[PDB]
Amino acid sequence: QHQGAVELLVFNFLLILTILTIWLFKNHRFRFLHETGGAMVYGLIMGLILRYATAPTDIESGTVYDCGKLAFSPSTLLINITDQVYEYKYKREISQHNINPHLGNAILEKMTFDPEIFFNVLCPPIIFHAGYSLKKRHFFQNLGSILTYAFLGTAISCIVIGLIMYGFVKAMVYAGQLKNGDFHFTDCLFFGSLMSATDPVTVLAIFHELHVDPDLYTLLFGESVLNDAVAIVLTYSISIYSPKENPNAFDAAAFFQSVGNFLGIFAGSFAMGSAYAVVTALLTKFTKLCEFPMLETGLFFLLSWSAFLSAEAAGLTGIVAVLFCGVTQAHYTYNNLSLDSKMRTKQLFEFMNFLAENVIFCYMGLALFTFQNHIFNALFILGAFLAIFVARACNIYPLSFLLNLGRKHKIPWNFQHMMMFSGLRGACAFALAIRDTESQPKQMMFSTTLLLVFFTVWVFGGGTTPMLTWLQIRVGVDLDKTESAWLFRMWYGFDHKYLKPILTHSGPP
Amino acid sequence: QHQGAVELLVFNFLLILTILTIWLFKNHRFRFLHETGGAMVYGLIMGLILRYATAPTDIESGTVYDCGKLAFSPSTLLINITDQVYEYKYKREISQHNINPHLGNAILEKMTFDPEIFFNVLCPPIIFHAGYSLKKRHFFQNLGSILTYAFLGTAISCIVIGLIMYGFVKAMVYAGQLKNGDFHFTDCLFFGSLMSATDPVTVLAIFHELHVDPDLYTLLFGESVLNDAVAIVLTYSISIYSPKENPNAFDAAAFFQSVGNFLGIFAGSFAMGSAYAVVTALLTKFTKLCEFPMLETGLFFLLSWSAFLSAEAAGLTGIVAVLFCGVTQAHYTYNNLSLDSKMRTKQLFEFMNFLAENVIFCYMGLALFTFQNHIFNALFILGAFLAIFVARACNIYPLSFLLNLGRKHKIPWNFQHMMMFSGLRGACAFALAIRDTESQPKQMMFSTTLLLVFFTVWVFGGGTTPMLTWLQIRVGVDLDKTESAWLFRMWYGFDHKYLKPILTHSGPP
Ligand SMILES: CCCCCCCC(=O)OC[C@H](COP(=O)(O)O[C@@H]1[C@H](O)[C@H](OP(=O)(O)O)[C@@H](O)[C@H](OP(=O)(O)O)[C@H]1O)OC(=O)CCCCCCC
Ligand SMILES: CCCCCCCC(=O)OC[C@H](COP(=O)(O)O[C@@H]1[C@H](O)[C@H](OP(=O)(O)O)[C@@H](O)[C@H](OP(=O)(O)O)[C@H]1O)OC(=O)CCCCCCC
């Protein structure tokens, strides 16, 4: 063996060093850096010292076999060698024979990760922890505004970024950096939808540490949680778009079917999550499992995982279903578990989320491991840099004014600048970029997104505190009907009238 | 996709049903069955209803390719298809072309697991939980007796089982069930070493529930923890045995080198575990990480995993190293962590152990998934049945009398019958049997071990309570120097003199 052990030990060493440096920084109260940034810089340093360590080496070239009567490449095959059947699995396709001698040199360790690892084992824990960790205080007086933000602003920013990137591509055509025709408006819309998920983890951590006003914290948290799933489903729907004839056409009667597919996927995921949540709530309520914390904790975890797996197997998106199942569980089941099971579940899920996010950011810090990188054409980077800023500018202020028109007697003025500053890009955009490879435009967007994350995360983590002090934002604040469109009051009355007495309020806690 | 999702959902459903039935049984206090037995019977039922559901189907035969100039089958290869390099990984070798049409029928879902999964991800959590969960009360007055038991009795039982199985094979040669010459004394010794690890999880659970005398509980726990690692290393050393000439020779000057390899492996694993434990203890003591439970918990978990990975990568055995690291950590570091981190680590590790053992037993309950089963030749099964009983008989009473000669003023008489009754076989024997396949003798021992586990676990789980009542064993007992060879007193004085003031006793807890 001794292949996975080395990389796992390297990851453990990097994580331990990151934790030690974070403790050292927090002991002196230097701040100006989060554990995510430390993991990123440690990954970058590790990659830099690994690439330029044993570069002079031998050149390894794979064997070439002329397999006649084979016009297709199946994933699975059975090869007859020495009259014996051997199961051969197609792993990946390599079309870089020209650069193969360069790939042989400085090979070291590939240390690559499967692109679905960020989807089936890494993201769902973080998403479920975010959904479960709901304050249940506030977040209802501003639920409507959060909804309009996370829904309309995502599409607005996607459209703006797509249009600006299409304009920059058209300008490049005049500049003639490369061939014209490869790029399309569909790719620009894909990039715009991808560059719309915001995960200001460092900003939220600073807000929690400094005890900022809970309204801004709740707004930012709700937006950052919802827009991730919104952008994921929107990106999937955009990738679904494929006209039968005249590729990259405009209004080919598939807009309606794409919208229908998006709505159906969202509704199905929400329904599955809610159904599983009420199923486990009823199971906990009817039974008397409060005397065995291990059994109920295992049932809770297994039911959550089964909800995720059933959402994935049905053809829908498991991330949004996990989010909705988690929020519904925290709403209903949390009032039925024993006093010990609540602590067990909360601590376990928060530890899993911490470990997953640290591993994600540490792997994201590795930028030298991708051999087919396309970090060039600085005009593209400048265009993306301007596009993200202008999209964030047009996202907040118009919608903020529209909400302030019919404001719920609580005008949120001077807080829009904080939302402007908080524009970090999390793991969702990186995973969506790494999902698709072996394509020059796709590699271009992946490299630009990596550079944008590398810049913006560090710069805003450094500048959060001075920006907070300059805006005179209140700090140190202790946490301890008709205005809400009259619909949320009716929903609350319906919840407290029928669902509460049956799903909870009875049974030994 | 939709391949792993189905099997994962099936596993989740089976586990949920097992937990529900366990709660139903415990509500009425019927007992007579543990969660492990429930998982086993549910797996057996699932396999039975899956095998005989859609048996009539089509016959699938793999393609045959005449790859000339290929006298070897590498694990990795690069195939040139359509002038493109495809990475093909050799997964498994199939030499069952004669039964291939039968394999095509009733294929359903393979649901198989990689044999190393029981080794690198499943066992280490259980082993670390067992090592960490040390009472620290008693277990020292009887440490010497536990050592002599787990060391001498394992080898004695292995030798007895090997000799008896060799005699039964020789009798079969006269009976002529199959060809003579395939079996060897090395295989008999391998089987004897494999059938020596005892994991009486149900007996220990019943003892904990009924509050039995702590002396017998501590003795059984220590024996069951130590003999597993002892048998693992002994089996590896036996598999190492390979004479240069005259295969299956007797006393080929390799006995000394095998003993040296065994001793070196044990010493290296113990040294690695202890070194990592003192490293993390010193790190916790010197720093002031008591104010951040998440950071210290992550450091603890990462250091334990790194200890396991470094033990595995060095060429030694990671299970015994994990065990020793866990016991040393529970001895030293547990007195330095904050009051919250202790609860976090304990609860997380016990939950991981519970989930891992439940999954292990549920997978063990699947006996119809292995197509190349050799459940026949009932004389072999009868021989193994007699051999395990006589080995357990000769394991306890002679060593018990020898210990009672120089007894530490505490004669353990009438408790030997309880140790005789507790003779369950856990996951270690099953994993060691499943490690090696594609061999008629190996399949024979695997099938016999599976049958032995299936019988003994259920029968002893059923009969534990009447056997306890018949022996008049005290129940309901509340837990709350020179005699110890004078060496353990010196060790305790040395620990309390030098190591304790430096490794602990200082720093904010
Ligand atoms: C919503 C609930 C909370 C979020 C989810 C929490 C669960 C969580 O994050 O960890 C999942 C892990 C591992 O489970 P997980 O890693 O997610 O399982 C992966 C899937 O089977 C995936 O298939 P698809 O997803 O269908 O494409 C496969 O390709 C991966 O193989 P690869 O890694 O070699 O690439 C598997 O690793 O499983 C446990 O830890 C408990 C069971 C361990 C013992 C049984 C093992 C079979
Ligand atoms: C002593 C300490 C306590 C006992 C050990 C506790 C740790 C524990 O049991 O789970 C281990 C899991 C998974 O880690 P784990 O499953 O053990 O990792 C396996 C090894 O890499 C194995 O290689 P070798 O062992 O060298 O042969 C490989 O073949 C398996 O691939 P396969 O599954 O497709 O067959 C991997 O799954 O990792 C975490 O849960 C935290 C990190 C997750 C995020 C990073 C993922 C890279």
Numbering used by the authors:
A (entry chain A), B (entry chain B): 17 to 496, 518 to 546
Copy text from the publication.
Na+/H+ exchangers facilitate the exchange of monovalent cations (Na+/Li+/K+) and protons (H+) across membranes to regulate intracellular pH, sodium levels and cell volume. Na+/H+ exchangers that perform this task are physiological homodimers, and whilst the ion transporting domain is highly conserved, their dimerization differs. The transporter is made up of two distinct domains, a dimerization domain and an ion-transporting (core) domain. Here, we report cryo-EM structures of E. coli NhaA and E. caballus NHE9 in complex with cardiolipin and phosphatidylinositol-3,5-bisphosphate PI(3,5)P2 lipids binding at their respective dimer interfaces.
To improve the resolution of the NHE9* structure we substituted L139 and I444 residues to cysteines in an attempt to disulphide-trap the inward-facing state. We subsequently collected a larger data-set of 13,780 movies and the final 3D-reconstruction had 78,370 particles from which an EM map was reconstructed to 3.2 Å according to the gold-standard Fourier shell correlation (FSC) 0.143 criterion. Map density and sulphur atom distances, however, did not support disulphide bond formation between the two introduced cysteine residues. Given that NHE9* co-purified from yeast with several lipids corresponding to the molecular mass of PIP224, we attempted to model two PIP2 lipids into the NHE9* CC maps and found that the density was a better fit for the phosphatidylinositol-3,5-bisphosphate PI(3,5)P2, lipid, rather than the more abundant phosphatidylinositol-4,5-bisphosphate PI(4,5)P2 lipid. The glycerol backbone and acyl chains of the PI(3,5)P2 lipid form hydrophobic stacking interactions to W321 (TM8, TM8’). Two glutamine residue Q17 (TM1, TM1’) and N136 (TM3, TM3’) are well positioned to hydrogen-bond with the C3-phosphate group. The position of these polar residues could partially explain the preference for PI(3,5)P2 lipids, since there are no polar residues close enough to interact with a phosphate group at the C4-OH position. Following a rigid-body fit of the TM2-TM3 β-hairpin loop domain in the NHE9*CC maps, the positively-charged loop domain residues K105, K105’ K107, K107’ were aligned to help neutralize the negatively-charge headgroups of PI(3,5)P2. In the improved NHE9*CC structure, we could model part of the C-terminal tail without protein complex partners. However, in the absence of a regulatory protein, the C-terminal interfacial helix in NHE9*CC is making a number of direct contacts with the linker helix TM7 through interaction with a lysine residue, likely restricting its mobility and that of the core transport domains.
